[PDB]
Design a protein around this ligand. Structure first.
Ligand code: HEC
Ligand code: MSS
Lengths: 81, 373
């Protein structure tokens, strides 16, 4: 038999917010990696930081996120984190 | 259940337990990324396998491996392509060992000011281990490197979840790869590699930042050009200058791939706000650099106004953590303790922190406030 490795359960969640970007982030930002990547970023970085993070996911890593969702996610993040 | 708080903003993390590991600081779950609690570095000179830090770029890490079917492929600009089993490696080549620090490019990124994006690590993304395996030099000589060869690329079993994302592939220069120290390590601290530390085989690149130490290593390609893969050409770049640094907020005009460690040192037996007994206070800790050797470690109890020479421990090799010990007279009250190391080519730590956009290569003189009573 091969050797196998058992990873513990993934429990990281996005902070809920009333903004539409919350749902959109749930649907787009967990596909390649856990969302603790987002939760652990430096706090209160603001609009420009999160705009750049979102764009990098799309342009460099080829995240399938459209323009309207990208803006919604970035605004949700800049307002919440 | 358990959490810790790292000493920078948004520093809360879960303590998480992975198979074969003690509880560690969980940075990310997918892919797994684990930082070592600072207290571990005061436990001894060699970092235990169950405490060793974990960093990965992509979520598609292997979770099932048959060590018997595993092959390392050697190809490209070589006379004879090779397909080597682990048993091949252990039997057909001579073994070497090296005690060497592995430290992430981004170790201590959480301390960078202004804060930058990326893995928000404290100082626990480093570790020192006894590595055993085959010098890459010997495998490459057997394949027969062609004149014309410029670089060697290294790839592992892990992969991107989405095929369009660039697969994790690194490159060394040919003369570096054939230097005799660059190693194909199948053993860490006398055991097989822990899974998350690259079971069954990894590249060990002594004195170089961790990004080069490719885990689950299965593909070696000798090429006669510069490799322009994303993880060399775009990621892991530093400012092309002596401080590897820019003015806070500024992008560099020129960059180069991250390469060799700068000089670091830490005080391990005390942490911020520790109580010590006024009088002779015994301090100890560690220092390391990129393989030139630690020449001395100085200690300060007046926030860098005056310095005392530490006594260096017997060493385990130029790539290892170098231990040190000092006894400092401390009057009652507050003291800001510092340590500063210099190496055999005269590199030392700056008193003031530098900055780059990636938050790479931090090595500022560490300060630790203690209370003497
Ligand atoms: C696969 C196509 C991705 C999707 C979908 C999203 N991101 Fe991502 N992200 C991706 C990679 C390959 C990495 C590197 C991980 C590593 O360990 O090096 C990341 C990392 C992040 C981070 C950390 C900081 C950084 O490296 O920039 C953040 C904050 C982040 N990702 C955010 C993020 C968001 C907001 C997404 C929805 C738009 C998202 N990611 C999707 C690849 C992928
Ligand atoms: N294969 C692979 N390998 C690899 C990876 C990935 O992702 N993949 N990562 C890197 C990094 S990035 Mo930064 O620079 S650090 C680091 C290292 C770590 O190791 P450990 O985990 O064993 O500790 O690894 C190395 N290797």
């Amino acid at each position: 038999a091969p050797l196998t490795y058992e990873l513990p359960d993934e429990t990281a969640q996005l902070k809920p917010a009333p903004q539409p970007g919350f749902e959109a982030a749930q649907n787009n930002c967990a596909a390649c990696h856990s969302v603790d990547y987002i939760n652990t970023q430096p706090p209160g970085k603001g609009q420009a930081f999160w705009d750049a993070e979102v764009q990098k996911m799309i342009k460099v890593y080829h995240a399938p996120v459209d323009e309207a969702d990208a803006k919604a996610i970035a605004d949700y993040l800049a307002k919440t984190y | 259940a358990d959490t810790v708080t790292l000493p920078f903003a948004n520093g809360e993390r879960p303590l998480v337990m992975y198979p074969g590991k003690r509880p560690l600081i969980g940075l990310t779950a997918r892919p797994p990324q684990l930082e070592t609690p600072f207290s571990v570095f005061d436990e001894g000179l060699i970092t235990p396998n169950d405490a060793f830090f974990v960093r990965y770029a992509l979520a598609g890490i292997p979770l099932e491996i048959d060590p018997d079917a595993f092959r390392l492929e050697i190809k490209g600009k070589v006379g004879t392509p090779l397909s080597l089993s682990l048993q091949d490696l252990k039997n057909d080549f001579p073994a070497s060992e090296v005690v060497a620090v592995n430290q992430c490019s981004g170790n201590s990124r959480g301390f960078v000011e202004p804060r930058v994006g990326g893995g928000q690590l404290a100082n626990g993304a480093m570790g020192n281990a006894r590595w055993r395996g085959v010098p890459l030099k010997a495998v490459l000589e057997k394949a027969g490197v062609q004149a014309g060869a410029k670089q060697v690329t290294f790839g592992g079993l892990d992969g991107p979840v989405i095929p369009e994302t660039p697969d994790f592939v690194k490159a060394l220069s040919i003369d570096h790869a054939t230097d005799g120290e660059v190693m194909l390590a199948y053993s860490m601290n006398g055991a097989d590699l822990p899974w998350l530390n690259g079971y069954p085989l990894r590249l060990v690149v002594p004195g170089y930042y961790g990004t080069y130490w490719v885990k689950h290593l299965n593909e070696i390609t000798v090429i006669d050009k510069e490799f322009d893969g994303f993880w060399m050409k775009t990621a892991y770049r530093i400012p092309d200058n002596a401080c590897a640094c820019t003015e806070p907020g500024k992008a560099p005009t020129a960059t180069i791939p991250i390469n060799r460690f700068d000089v670091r040192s830490f005080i391990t037996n005390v942490e911020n706000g520790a109580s010590v007994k006024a009088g002779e206070v015994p301090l100890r800790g560690i220092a390391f650099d990129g393989g030139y050797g630690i020449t001395q470690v100085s200690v300060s109890a007046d926030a860098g106004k005056s310095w005392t020479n530490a006594t260096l421990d017997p060493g385990l090799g130029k790539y290892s953590f170098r231990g040190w010990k000092a006894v400092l007279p401390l009057t009652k009250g507050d003291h800001v303790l510092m340590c500063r190391a210099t190496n055999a080519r005269g590199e030392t730590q700056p008193m003031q922190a530098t900055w780059n956009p990636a938050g790479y290569m931090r090595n500022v003189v560490e300060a630790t406030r203690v209370i003497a009573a």
